[PDB]
Ligand binder design. Structure first.
Ligand SMILES: NC(=O)c1ccc[n+]([C@@H]2O[C@H](COP(=O)([O-])OP(=O)(O)OC[C@H]3O[C@@H](n4cnc5c(N)ncnc54)[C@H](OP(=O)(O)O)[C@@H]3O)[C@@H](O)[C@H]2O)c1
Ligand SMILES: [Mg+2]
Length: 282
């Protein structure tokens, strides 16, 4: 169904735009035409939330969204993210000096052809690992805060953050969404999802099917089979019923998968099936 993200209601089945680019989200996509077709069909299918970034393929993913969908329905929310830059070797690097965050915000503005960004995710990176790690984010957020006052950005969100960081952030500005790694097999954020929900802040999982062990994978497959669904559909449907503040942004460069992902809304998970799925992580 729906969720109010900032001041705009969004269909909880949205679209991640990260597959509309070359391998490693770098360079142009396989086929620009199919990318355009996928975006247009998504809208036609009821998508009104698109997740993107200007460091996808540097810039080209945003330009495709523009070529395909400008001028945008005013029902449409485009969410983008800043905080990283791309090496010319496809590498992802820290990019959170005021100059870089300001340039990133304007890059988005130009490539999407917008006058203001709906939602900007600040994407955190601490330590030498990849995921959530402790450290103050005040400096970056203050910069995003100022561009909000200037009217370049309506709403601020967070990406790849620990519960403490969210807590530090929410004293500097309003946070409308948190975007973290989370799926059936990786449920460390469970507590935060419920707490966010109670404050009306959305939570946005990525890797819906990522990093499953064979046993984890075969269980999901078993469940799909018995339901006449695909594993992807089961994964999305589980996310949908897990909490009402959860927004899905599955990415795909294929129209068939798009329609299939969107069909996941029709799938209804019995208690016995949820029992099996909740045990995948345990
Ligand atoms: N903020 C961050 O730190 C960050 C990091 C990662 C992702 N994200 C966002 O989150 C979104 C989701 O990305 P993700 O990393 O969670 O992974 P994902 O986009 O859900 O997975 C992408 C892969 O799944 C395949 N796929 C999609 N639907 C399928 C289906 N129905 N059947 C079989 N395969 C299917 C795609 O292949 P096909 O193209 O051939 O269908 C593609 O190879 C992204 O679009 C991006 O915007 C953000
Ligand atoms: Mg993706």
């Amino acid at each position: 169904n729906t969720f109010t993200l900032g001041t705009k209601s969004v269909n909880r089945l949205g679209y991640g735009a990260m597959q509309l680019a070359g391998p490693g989200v770098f360079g142009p996509p396989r086929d620009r035409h199919v990318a355009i077709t996928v975006l247009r069909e998504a809208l036609a299918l009821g998508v009104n939330h698109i997740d993107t970034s200007d460091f996808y393929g540097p810039h080209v993913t945003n330009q495709i969204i523009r070529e395909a969908l400008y001028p945008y329905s005013d029902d449409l929310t485009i969410v983008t993210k800043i905080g990283a830059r791309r090496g010319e070797d496809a590498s992802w690097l820290p990019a959170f000096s005021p100059a870089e965050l300001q340039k990133a915000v304007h890059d988005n503005l130009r490539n999407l052809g917008l006058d203001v960004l709906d939602v900007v995710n600040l994407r955190v990176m601490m330590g030498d690992g990849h995921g959530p790690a402790e450290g103050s984010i005040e400096a970056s957020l203050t910069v995003l805060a100022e561009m909000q006052q200037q009217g370049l950005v309506k709403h601020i969100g967070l990406s790849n953050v620990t519960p403490t960081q969210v807590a530090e952030a929410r004293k500097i500005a309003e946070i409308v969404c948190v975007q973290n790694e989370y799926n059936i097999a990786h449920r460390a954020d469970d507590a935060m999802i419920d707490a966010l929900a109670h404050d009306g802040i959305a939570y946005v999982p990525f890797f819906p099917l990522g990093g499953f062990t064979p046993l984890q994978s075969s269980t999901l497959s078993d469940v799909a089979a018995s339901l006449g669904a695909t594993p992807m559909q089961v994964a999305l449907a589980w996310l949908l019923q897990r909490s009402p503040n959860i927004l899905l942004i599955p990415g795909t460069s294929s129209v068939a998968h798009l329609r299939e992902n969107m069909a996941a809304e029709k799938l209804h998970l019995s208690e016995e099936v949820l029992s099996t799925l909740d045990g995948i992580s345990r």
